[PDB]
Amino acid sequence: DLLFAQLSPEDLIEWSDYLPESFTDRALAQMGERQRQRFELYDQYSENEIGRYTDHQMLVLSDKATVAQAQRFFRRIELDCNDNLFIVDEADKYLGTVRRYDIFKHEPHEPLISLLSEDSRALTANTTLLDAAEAIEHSREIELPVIDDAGELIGRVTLRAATALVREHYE
Amino acid sequence: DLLFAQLSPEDLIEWSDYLPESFTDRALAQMGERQRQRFELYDQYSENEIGRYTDHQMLVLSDKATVAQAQRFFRRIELDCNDNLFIVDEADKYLGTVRRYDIFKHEPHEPLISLLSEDSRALTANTTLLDAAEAIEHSREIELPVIDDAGELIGRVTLRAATALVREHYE
Amino acid sequence: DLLFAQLSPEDLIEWSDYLPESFTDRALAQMGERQRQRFELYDQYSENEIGRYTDHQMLVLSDKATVAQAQRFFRRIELDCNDNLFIVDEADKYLGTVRRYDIFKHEPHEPLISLLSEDSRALTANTTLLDAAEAIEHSREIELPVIDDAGELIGRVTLRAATALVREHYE
Ligand SMILES: [Cl-]
Ligand SMILES: [Cl-]
Ligand SMILES: [Cl-]
Ligand SMILES: [Cl-]
Ligand SMILES: [Cl-]
Ligand SMILES: [Cl-]
Numbered sequence A, B, C: 001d002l003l004f005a006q007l008s009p010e011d012l013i014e015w016s017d018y019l020p021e022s023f024t025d026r027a028l029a030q031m032g033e034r035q036r037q038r039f040e041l042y043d044q045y046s047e048n049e050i051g052r053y054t055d056h057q058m059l060v061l062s063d064k065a066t067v068a069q070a071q072r073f074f075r076r077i078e079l080d081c082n083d084n085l086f087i088v089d090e091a092d093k094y095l096g097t098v099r100r101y102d103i104f105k106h107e108p109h110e111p112l113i114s115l116l117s118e119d120s121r122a123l124t125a126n127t128t129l130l131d132a133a134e135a136i137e138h139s140r141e142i143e144l145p146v147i148d149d150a151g152e153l154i155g156r157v158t159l160r161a162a163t164a165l166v167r168e169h170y171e
Helices: A009-014 A021-030 A035-045 A067-076 A129-137 A161-169 B011-014 B022-029 B032-046 B066-077 B130-135 B158-170 C009-014 C021-030 C031-045 C067-076 C129-137 C157-171
Strands: A060-062 A085-089 A092-100 A145-147 A155-157 B060-062 B086-087 B094-099 B143-147 B153-158 C060-062 C085-090 C094-099 C145-148 C153-158
Touching: A009 A021, A009 A035, A009 B066, A021 A035, A021 B022, A021 C021, A035 C021, A060 A067, A060 B143, A067 C085, A092 B094, A129 A145, A129 A155, A129 A161, A145 B060, A145 C067, A155 A161, A155 C129, B011 B022, B011 B032, B060 C157, B086 B153, B130 B143, B130 B153, B153 B158, C009 C021, C009 C031, C060 C067, C094 C145, C129 C145, C129 C153, C129 C157, C153 C157
Parallel strands: A060 A085, B060 B086, C060 C085
Antiparallel strands: A085 A092, A145 A155, B086 B094, B143 B153, C085 C094, C145 C153
C-alpha cells in the first residue's frame, strides 16, 4: 500500500510548482528507471512536442557494426513495431536507418554504414504530436527515430503510439 | 536464495564496526530505496531518537500550493494514519499543518499558507521515543511531522508507529 | 515484453564495439545491481581470468570482529557452498580465512584475527579458469577467496562454480 507507487512521473511533472524538490527526488529514487526516463522527457519537452512521448527502447548500433550484428539483433530481440535499426556515429549522431528486409539480403561482413536506407527520415523532438502521427501513419514505416536539436538519436516513436496520440487528440 | 536479501539495513547498522565498508555499500546498492532510507536514518539517529523511526511517506506541499492541490492530494492518495498535510517553504522548512476536515471547507483558490492550523506541533528528531509516543497518543492527531535541527521537515510519525514503540518499551 | 530485460550484461560486453555507450548505460541502469556487478567483472577481467566469474556474495568481517560475530554470521545466513569466513583489514586487504568448524570451538570474545587458518589460500583474479577449478576441487575447501592485484578481497569462487567451469571447458 505504498505512496510513491501511487504517483506517476507525470503527476510529479504536473505538480512541479507545488511539491518540494526533496519530495520529487525521493519519488524518483523509488520509481523504476523507465519511469525516471519518462520524467526526464516530460521535464525537457512540453506537451505538444514528440520528444515527450519518445521511447528509448530501440534497435541501434554504431557505425562500426556489420550486417552480421544487425541480423543477430533482429533475431534475438522481440520488440513492438520494430523492423528498422538505427545507426549512430561515436558521438551518438543519427546517421540513418537500415531495414530488416534489406539487411537479410546482404552479406554479413558488410558495414551497415554502407547500406543506409535512402528513404529514411527522423523526427525532430520538437515536432508536434499530430505532425509526428501523420509522418508515421502516411509512410511505409512502423516506427521512426527521434533526434534532439544536437542531432543525437534519443529514441523512437511507434505506429502504435501514433494511434494513441491521434485518438487522444479526438477525445 | 540471496545474501543481501537476508540482511536488514538494521543488521548493517548494528554490525557497522565489523563489516567492511565495501560490503555495506554492496548491500545498500542491492536493497530497495526504502531500505536505504531506513539505513540513513539509523545511521544519523541513535536508538532513543524519534528521527530513527521517521517515515518519509507523507502529504507535503510547498507554500505556493492552494486548497485545490490539497483536496486533490487527499482524494488521490491512500496513506496509513493520514489526515493532515504539511506545508514547507522553498528551503524545506516546516511552516505548519493543514487538516483534511478544514481544507474541505475552504475555497479551492485559497493559499494553504493562509490556512495553517493553530494547534499544529512538530516533533524534533531528537525527541525520545516515549515522549514522541505520548505526544501523538495524547492529542487529537493521528500523525505528527518530524523536523531536523535545521527546521527541515524530514518525515512523520504515525499513531500506529507510536503504538509499536510503546509495546516495544513494555517488552 | 521489455528490451533491456532481454539482454544480459554478457551480451553487452560481447557487443561493446557495436553498441553506443548511451545504450549500454541505459541497459545498465535498468538492470539489477547483481547484473551490473557481473558487467563490471566481465569488463575488467578477460575470458580466461577467474575474476570474471567471482561472486561478491560471501561471509567477510574486518579484523575488529570476534568469534561471537563469526558464529552469528554462520547461523543467520544461508549461503551456497559456504563454510568459511574471510577477514580483511580496514583497507579491505585479505588477511585470512576462519573455518566454521574451528570457530565453533573457540570462545566468543576471541578476535578472529588471532584464529586465522594456517591452510588458507586465496586465488589471484588473474588465475586461469582451470587452475582455479583445480585449486578448489583438489583441496578440502568448498570455496576460495579471490583477491585483486592490490591484495583486496573482491569475492569468492565456489566448488559448484568450479564444476560448471570444468563442464564448460569439456563442451
Ligand atoms: Cl554478432
Ligand atoms: Cl543470441
Ligand atoms: Cl491540482
Ligand atoms: Cl488524480
Ligand atoms: Cl554479534
Ligand atoms: Cl540474527
